[PDB]
């Protein structure tokens, strides 16, 4: 990715990242399952449900995603009626 | 009864058990070979098969003649 822009000399975000992942303010990232729209006739219903769910990403994936994205995307946003509002903060977390 | 084993073994597996046998041995598949390209017996890479083709035929025929009843009828095609 571009560490120093040629116009302004600041970092740039990889837009491939932004249209695939949701980052929560706490530091987690959310993705969809790969192939959730693919060939559903042959898949079993349990398999289908496992596909529909929005999952988290492990530490390294999360680290890589944060490097590929600017500080703007990491700020706290007070959207009106976002369905992900509750998930922004953690609860009862000791290490 | 449907079984997927070597036809040659039948001679020593079952004997004097059948009154009627039909033996349709693997052949050069004349019409099929002239028309069909893929998996052709005449493909030059698979030359080795043809060298061991004639003996196999005898073997398979024999298995039938070993399995048939005394006075039993075998037809070979």
């Amino acid at each position: 990715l571009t560490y120093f822009s040629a116009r302004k000399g600041k970092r740039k975000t990889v837009k491939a990242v932004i249209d695939r992942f949701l980052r929560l303010h706490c530091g987690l990232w959310v993705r969809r399952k790969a192939g959730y729209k693919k060939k559903l006739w042959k898949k079993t219903p349990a398999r289908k449900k496992r596909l529909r769910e929005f999952v988290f990403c492990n530490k390294t994936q999360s680290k890589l995603l944060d490097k590929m994205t600017t500080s703007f995307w990491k700020r706290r946003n007070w959207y009106v009626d976002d369905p992900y509002q509750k998930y922004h903060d953690r609860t009862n977390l000791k290490v | 009864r449907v079984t997927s084993w070597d036809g040659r073994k039948w001679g020593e597996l079952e004997g004097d058990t059948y009154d009627r046998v039909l033996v349709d041995v693997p052949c050069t598949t004349d019409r099929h070979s002239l028309h069909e390209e893929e998996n052709n017996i005449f493909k030059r890479s698979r030359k080795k098969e043809r060298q061991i083709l004639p003996v196999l035929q005898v073997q398979l025929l024999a298995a039938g003649l070993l399995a048939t009843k005394p006075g039993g009828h075998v037809v070979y095609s």
């Binding site: - | 009864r1 079984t3 084993w5 073994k9 020593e12 597996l13 079952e14 004997g15 004097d16 058990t17 009843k69 005394p70």
Partner: protein, 123 residues
């Protein structure tokens, strides 16, 4: 588990194995022959005598008589004495009593379950 003293408690197939006279009972009446065949078979079962088959070949073309056969095996020469005496005494109505033997010229259609282990031992 092998080292534990409970080993081979699950062994079952060792208890099983995975590996001759013919009696003629011809009668003209078709209500009689099978009844006596039944009786002889019952006597065989009671005294632990092995039975193969009760085969029937078709009626002779016309007038018309039909044959009922019972295959028996495991009979000793000494035990034959008692056995044959009873089957002679029990004769209902002028029924021809025969004792025929397999003369090595008299093959079976094997079942699919039986064939697999036969193939395994063949090769």
């Amino acid at each position: 588990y092998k080292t534990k003293p409970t080993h081979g408690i699950g062994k079952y197939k060792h208890l099983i194995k995975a590996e001759v006279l013919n009696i003629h009972l011809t009668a003209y009446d078709m209500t009689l022959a099978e009844s006596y065949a039944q009786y002889v078979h019952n006597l065989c079962n009671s005294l632990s005598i092995k039975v193969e088959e009760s085969y029937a070949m078709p009626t002779k073309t016309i007038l018309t008589t039909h044959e009922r056969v019972v295959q028996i095996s495991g009979l000793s020469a000494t035990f034959a004495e008692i056995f044959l005496e009873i089957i002679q005494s029990s004769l209902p109505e002028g029924v021809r009593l025969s004792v025929k033997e397999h003369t090595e010229e008299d093959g079976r259609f094997k079942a699919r379950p039986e064939l697999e282990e036969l193939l395994a031992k063949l090769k």
